[model samples]
Target chain A: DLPAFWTVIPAAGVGSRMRADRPKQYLDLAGRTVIERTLDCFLEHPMLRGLVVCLAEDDPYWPGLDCAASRHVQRAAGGAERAGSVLNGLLRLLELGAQADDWVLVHDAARPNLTRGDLDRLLEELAEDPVGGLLAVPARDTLKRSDRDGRVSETIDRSVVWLAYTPQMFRLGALHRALADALVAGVAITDEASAMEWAGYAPKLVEGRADNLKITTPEDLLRLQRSFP
Target chain B: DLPAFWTVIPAAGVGSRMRADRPKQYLDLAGRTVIERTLDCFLEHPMLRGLVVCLAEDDPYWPGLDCAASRHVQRAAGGAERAGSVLNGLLRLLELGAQADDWVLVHDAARPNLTRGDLDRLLEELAEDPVGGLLAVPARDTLKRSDRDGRVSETIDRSVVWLAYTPQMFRLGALHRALADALVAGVAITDEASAMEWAGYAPKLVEGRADNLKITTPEDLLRLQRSFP
Candidate 1:
């Protein structure tokens, strides 16, 4: 049996690069919206306690979704950046009687293809860990550092480099404090794990499949449709 | 019209991670083998002069392929490493009377999804560049550096990092000498661009679509089939 954990999804971003009819999370993936499919993974999981979805102010898309009516899912007002949105979601979790040390799994709303196995593995590996972890994959291709003029500066050491992915797990209070502190200090918080790292915690790296891709562009949506179809 | 360029495909590796019945190059993709699809991009291009494919010494799969009989394609014995195989292919191009300054585009046999637009863009952008470039995509995800214990050491500065993809374009004689000298000095030549960098040449980064994937695992193969289907 796995330990119970609440999920927080930061869905506020407009995803300008996708250049679609709507924000990427609201776009169609297969027959369902990307965020709807993303929510299903946690909603179906036995270990899931509850989840909070952070949405932008004055956004019109979320209310029409069937998941919007789900009892287990709660809504929170989003913030300017992903870090701020996540912190807002964590605060909502705290208001709902979440313990200081309770596990909180933060996932990207755009990543609709996350598998149960990867999620389970992430939960299993980090359940007993001192510092919680996130799903990641090792860099398979040769990485190049480009100079200011868009020229190859050097080949990075691929061995130590990893492509960070989501379902990043951490304690609710710890994550909340980390993000709040980092944001207060005006540090760049790209992800929840980075926030944890800023708070002097070395988050564990749980290797996951490469296909748990975030839908960033129109091509990604097309690929997801074809992949599921 | 784009400048005529020779193509070199290094196809010797066993691709141990793929765990296919035969070498990954021989594996069926859509309706054709991986290498066949890879070769077709160059073979069908009007700007292509000729191509050299470096295959293993004991490989039996190449003779049965229809590409073996193509007038524009020639074969060379592959070497222990990718750098060596590419060098051998360059030597073969030289033997065919390719000029010292003739452009050579070295692509991977496993990367069959390379689009014509990307190839044309790479050629167009680097036609007059003193140091030619490769097809690459900017890093989309936040990157992480892992400690020995598989923990997040820090979040890397991803702004300047790019994922290097092929059809790395360079001059035949210049690339040949770069690889040979780098190999002699026991330098790790991860890709053709790295070798050029070692020889004090900054290869340009031509932005390309991220879908240009190299098949390294069974999952990647499945994704490609579904993507194209």
Candidate 2:
């Protein structure tokens, strides 16, 4: 049986590289929005507990979604940084009957195609650990460090490198403490796992499918559509 | 007017991490093989001087293709190392009437989707350049450097990091000398750009569209089919 875990989706960013009409989370994917498909991955799981969605403080689109009325989904105001948005989601998770010791998965609102096999594998691998981890894939290409003017300086070690992805799992209290404290210390944390790392914990890197893409640009939307068709 | 250039494609590598029948370049895409589509790009170009294809020494497939008899194309036996295959193609170009000062674009047989605009841009940008470069895209995600057991030690600066792509354009004599010497010294060269960098040349990084994908796995095959369909 799959383990029950709470989820926090950070969806508060302004969205896209200054060309899109709406935030990527709210953008339509076939008949639904990106976040809707993303939420379905968790909500459809038979073992899902409750989930919290962190949206912009003045979000105009979330109120119109049919999923906005889900009894299992709680809403929260977002923050200046994605870490703050995640912290806000944690607070909402607590109010929705979550305990500090419960597992909370912080997933990206933009990655909607995360396979169940990958997510289950991540849970199975990291559930027994003291400090939890996130889904990641090994770097497949020859990565180069280049100068400002586009001259490669060096070839990096691809064997020990990974591209970090979401559905990062951690205990609620530990994650909350890590992000809150990291924020207090003015340490810039890009993801929840980074915050935990800043607090001196070695987060696990659970390998997953390479197709769990974050919709950061216009081309990604096309890639997602092609995937569905 | 476009600059006339020689071309080389190293096509001898075998299958991916599985039991595919042949190398990825021989696999079907739409109605034609991967390498066929790749060759079409250069053969259709107005100013292409000549081209060389390096096939596996004991391979059975290249002899059956109709284009194998094209007068403009020369064939050479390939080697175990991909760099060696490229070296052999360089030698083939020389016998096929290539001058020492001619520019050669060493491309991947598996990369069939390089847009004409990108190729033109690469040629136009490097026409007068002392050191030619390859098509590369910046690392979009927060790359992590991890240990053997999946513990991330540090977050890398993505702004200066790029994923190297092909066709890596360079002067024939310089590339040949750089690659041959590097091989003799047992230096590891991931791509032609690396060998040039090792030989103390600052190969420029030409910014192009990022869809230039090397078909490395089965899923990439599926993605390619989706693209054509």
Candidate 3:
């Protein structure tokens, strides 16, 4: 059996590099909106509690995303920063009577192909671990640290590093502390797991699926759909 | 009970560009030999009758490949070229009394992640069409016909073209005839389907899994494994 957990999806970014009129998360992928499919993975999970979406106040796709509004699917206005947006959404969960010890999973809205198996394995592996874990894949390429001119700077050891995916799982209290600490210390963390790492929490590396990719550009979306079939 | 069908694996190539000590098919992948895992898919498939491997007589991996040999596994001494190797393997099948239209599937031994779903779907879809089909994926990239200097000459129309993968399927008789004709015509062909196309046969396109990738290079094999969990 899977554990009951709430999902937070950060979809505030304008995705300027994608050069799309709408937000990147609302872009079509194999006849479905990217965010729609990403949200459905959590919604369809047998043990999922509910969802909270972090969206910009004046997002062009917000009106179109009205179809996703439901009793269990709530939204909160985003902030200038990603961490701030996640904080705002987590507070919204508090107003809805969510407890701090309950699991909170922070995932990127851009990744659309999260599989049931990937989620199940992540949950199972982290269940007994002292610190919570996130989904990731072992780095298979030769690691190279290159300078601006493409000259070899160093060969970084990749044995300990992984290509991180999400949702990064944690007890709501632990995540809240990690995020708040980073914010107070003026740390510009890239991901939720990064914030946790900064606070000295060693998150377990759970195997993630390759299909679960972040669609940062138009090429990524094309490759994402191609990966499905 | 599942239907019994023989599998033909074309593994005659030296794969010199892969920069490996042994042929690309015999390299280690995720703790198992690449060819072994490729064969395991068929051996584990309930529909499989037996498997025929086409190998060069002087290949270094011949001795190491004996671990995969069993009553249901057969290895035929290959000819000078890829088409010739396939022909030699098919002749061995004829000697073993396989029928002309007994659903021959010619696959690459380097594709370790070939799934039963892909093979079954190919067989099922081709059963409805008059001409047999090869596994393929729609071209998702911006393909260009490049000039000698590597500049874009023209964008080739991808509306009708697909990136063809294997196993290319046909009646054993039709495949034999197609290859023999292409060989006698002195035209070098890349795949068995190309020979069939030259014989004026429009083989149907069966959609294949993107994960079913040919491990042509060392980097390709590494990426192929990473393409899974």
Candidate 4:
């Protein structure tokens, strides 16, 4: 039997890159709001115990979504940064009777294209892993490191580099501890995997589709519209 | 005044990942072959002096493309590897009376989404640079280095890292020498920029759009079809 797993969506950040009237998570994607489409994947997963979404305290958009009324979903007060929002979600999970060892898949509220197959693959690959993994894509393009003035400093080894995607799967207690400690130390926590890495744990990398993109720009929103339409 | 630039498209490699009946370049995208769409940008550019496309020795698809017979374009016999093919194309450029100091923009034959604005931006950014640069996009996702067991070894700094795209421009002579020396020295030449790097030149990095994708997989092809249509 698989270990019980829950989902956490950190939907706090106002996507300034999108430059939309509201947060990108509230923007319409396909037929639903981006957050609703994102939540659908985990909500439909049979093995999912529950999900906790971290939202802005004054987020006016969450109340209008139909899935906001779902029995399987819970809300937590979000924070200034993505890592803080994720930590709050973990605390909320604990309050909701989630065990310390239960797996938590932290996903982006704006990334709505995550397929069920990729989710299944991530769960299957990290079922017995001591340190859970995240879905990623290998660096197909040659990578560069630029100097402050935008000149190329060096070419990085692309063979070893992978672009991290989510849902990043980690144990609830271990992730909470790692994130808390890292935040306390003022270390930059870009993602759940980074928090785990800062805590000296090597999370596994599950290869996933490149189309599982985080909608950041207007072009990205248009692409998502055309892709599903 | 900007230096005259010739294009070199290495179209020799059989895209094994595409899993198509023919090479990916010959695959129909929109209404034309993938290479046609790729070549359209440079072919239509008023600044282009000429172009040399490196094709497989036995390729049956090239003759059918209307651009193959155009006065601005010439063909060169391709080699086993991309580096070899590029070197051959540069030699053909030399044979075509191109000066060593002329700029050569090496591009992928399957990347059809190259925008005119990005191309113009790249040309504009690198016009006065000592070492020419390529079109690139900043790393938006968290990056990871995987261990042999496919677990995350570490999280890389996303801020200085960029994903290299093409129309990688360099002086024909400098690029020819750099690529030849690097290839002959058995240094891995993933792109023209890498060869320039090995020759002690720090090429500039011109930020470009992420949609300038190379068609490597069926999903990529589908995405391109939808994007263009």
Candidate 5:
């Protein structure tokens, strides 16, 4: 059997950076919405066990999508923060009879360009990994540590630095505990991996495409539109 | 009279990452080559004092470009590496009587997306600053420090981290000395600002577009074509 895993998509957040009429995940990416495009990647995958999209309580767009009605896709209550939304999605998987050892991938709802190649590599590479890793890319640009006033503090070591991207996979229990503990300690969980790191686990880095962009700003929308159109 | 500056472009790169027959700068970006589009940012600016393009010794494609024959543009012998190419271009500037206090911007020949806005901003922001700065964007993604084996060692502080982009501006003498010293010491100099940082100067970071990409791979070129075309 192919490596099976659940997917938790955090589609909460107002997407303030997008400066749009709606959340970024609901924005038009080609003919489909951004979240729909994102879901398409997972839905088409044979190994994909189940998918849960965490949406806001008053999400106006999710129920309208054709994919929303599909048996493969389900909705969960979104949380106030990213971590909360992801945690809720994990709980949904648990309620659906997911075991503690089952793997769950947390993907960004606005990131639609996750190629099949990268998706395959992520699963294949981390199949038997000690701690599941997330897809990332090597830092290509020169790195700088800026001060409060935007002055260059120092140049960082770029050789081994990586830009973290998604389909971040982890065991359901471990991820749940790490995230729960991190939240209890009032830690700033930037991502699931960061939470895992705080929980003393060194997640692996699976290099993926640098172009798997997460749409934030209006310019990002334009970039995606031009490239993906 | 206007806030003037010299421009140096290091075009000596073999562009191996591109996996193309010719160097990436020579590749057709829509219609004009990448180098031509890059040069447009400088040539179109009234404050640009003069320019030098450092090319490979047997650069076959550069001479044929329509922009190559312009009076405003000059040429320099490219060196074995990026620092060397830049240093040679600086020497050419010195030969042409560019004063020590004059500013120079060392840009990548393949990075064709240096918008006039960013170019103007780089100049404007660093105009009165004692030390010069380069264009950059704050790191939006979570950062990771990977080991030699590509395992995540730690989550880096992404708040003040900036991905260094160019049109890096600096005084001719200061940059030349820093680069010269760095080359002599056999230190790994990633950029002109890195050299300056090694010499104990903190360069400023002028916020710019995340899309100001340095085309290194085939995918990057495709991204640009889709957007700019």
Candidate 6:
């Protein structure tokens, strides 16, 4: 009795900035692979219907995870950019008979601690909103806009600034059209919600857990390890 | 069914080092008092009988908290020293008919995020060991033994060092005897385990969560707020 929903996990990028031998998504966090934990968040959600995991075409590591095969989770090849990979995953969801305007959730594979409580809260908050929403934390830190040399610059007002976490949810049709239109126009999109924003859709901000962090650096792994309950 | 375990939470002493007008234990964490969260951890435990909250006689804060009082957890007047406060708590427990050799868990009221999982893990690991164990983490950072002048006097080996966290567990009889002896001899004790060690007892070191930190300074509270779920 699951709702009509799609989960697209974009894991294509080389993650060159992380400077790791393995893809950042494959990095072990706490005790499990980051992607595995990311997938578990949605898989454990009662409303989730389908999951699509997008991986790089030439990545040699995806085939060895025996747990994925047993879980009946589909794996598909990814595209050059993050948006492209998401588009690819969306197409695979359509191929699996997912209807347009059905809810689509785009979650970062590196964010493993996205609890089911976080998902439930997001769904409840976004239910009344037309443009859906993204999980974020209210910025408690001082915001500083620095110069090239990192000198004291403008201290921007932080009242409206929020640190965005994921599962960014949207109507599947709206997101697919937004990304496709952006791709056709050669417009660069940083995140799924950004594409919607450019298309004049204002998404709401659903407050998320601080523990739902993106593991971007070696130091981040240590931080994640320390955060492990 | 409850287990024969007595929990002592030392909440005494003006937290002057924290530099807060209020006691550090009464400080707001997330949305609740730090002591409320700390007590919640143990009171929610299935095996816990009850808790003894040790506070100073002239302390003006704790009695105002309804949440802390509702648990029917007994309160005892604290002593001048931290170890002495704990010993006083033990005497209070004894007056309430606590049996010798029954398990006694000495925890700091400042440690807010102590979880049931950590407690269960500690209990499981210590079950087979005759002397019981204390929660600790392996020292992962570089070790520098510093001199009085704030200079690194020597590079100490950290391989054998484990950063001890609290909820240090021991048999009530052993701990009572050791601490009572130390008090009589005018010996200072740093921790419950130190008293046990001085009594020629070796407790096992159970690996604990790094999040189980004692809230000491204002910086400690800030870190706890960030680290807390």
RMSD of each: 3.8, 3.8, 17.7, 3.6, 3.5, 18.2
For all predicted structures, in order, the TM-scores are 0.85, 0.86, 0.51, 0.86, 0.88, 0.50
**lDDT of model 1 at position A112:** 91
Cα lDDT, all candidates:
0.88, 0.85, 0.72, 0.85, 0.86, 0.73
Clashing pairs in 2: none
- CA-RMSD of model 1: 3.8
lDDT of 2 at B26: 81
Per-chain TM-score of chain B, candidate 5?
0.92
TM-score of chain A of 6: 0.90
User: What tens-digit string does per-residue lDDT give for candidate 1 at A65-105?
Assistant: 99888898998888888888888898898889899999999
Q: Using TM-score, give the best candidate's number.
A: 5
CAPRI category for model 4: medium
lDDT tens digits by residue: candidate 1, B60-176: 778779998888789888888999999999999988989989999999999999888999999999999997999999887788999899998888898899999999999988998
Cα lDDT over the full model 4: 0.85
Question: What lDDT tens digits, residue by residue, belong to model 5 across residues A1-229?
Answer: 3478999988886533434467777888778888888998899888888899888776667667898779988889888899999999999998998999998999998899999899989998998988899999988777899888888998887888888999998999999999998999999988899999999999999989988989885456655674564
DockQ score for model 5: 0.61
Tens digits of per-residue lDDT, candidate 6, B53-78, equal 88887666766778645845888888
- Model 5 chain A poorest ten-residue lDDT run: A13-22
Residue pair clashes in candidate 4: none
The Cα error of candidate 6 at residue A167, in Å, is 0.5
Chain B structural similarity as TM-score, candidate 3: 0.89
- Angstrom error of the Cα, residue A106, model 6: value is 0.4
Q: Candidate 6 lDDT, tens digit per residue, A1-229? A: 2244679888886543434467767788777777787787888666777888888766666666664575557767788888999999999988988888788999998888888888888887777667787887754432333234322133333455555678988988899999999988887577887778668766777778876878775445654665555
Candidate 6 DockQ vs. native: 0.01
Give per-residue lDDT, candidate 5, residue A93.
94
Runs of candidate 5 with Cα error greater than 4 angstroms are A14-22, A28-31, A44-46, A147-150, A217-229, B14-20, B147-150, B222-229
Screening candidate 6 with a backbone cut-off below 3 angstroms (N, C-alpha, C), the clashing residue pairs are none
- Give the alpha carbon lDDT tens digit for every residue of B1-229 in model 4: 5556789999986533334477878888878999989988888888888888897766767777898778878999888799999999999988888998888899999899999999888888888888899999888777888779888887888889998998899998899899999988999888899999999999998889888988886456755665674
The runs of at least 3 residues in candidate 4 whose Cα sits more than 4 Å from the true structure, single-residue gaps closed, are: A14-23, A26-30, A147-151, A221-229, B14-22, B148-150, B221-229
* Candidate 3 wrong stretches, greater than 4 Å: A15-21, A146-150, A226-229, B1-229
iRMSD values, candidates in order: 2.3, 2.2, 20.8, 2.3, 2.4, 23.1
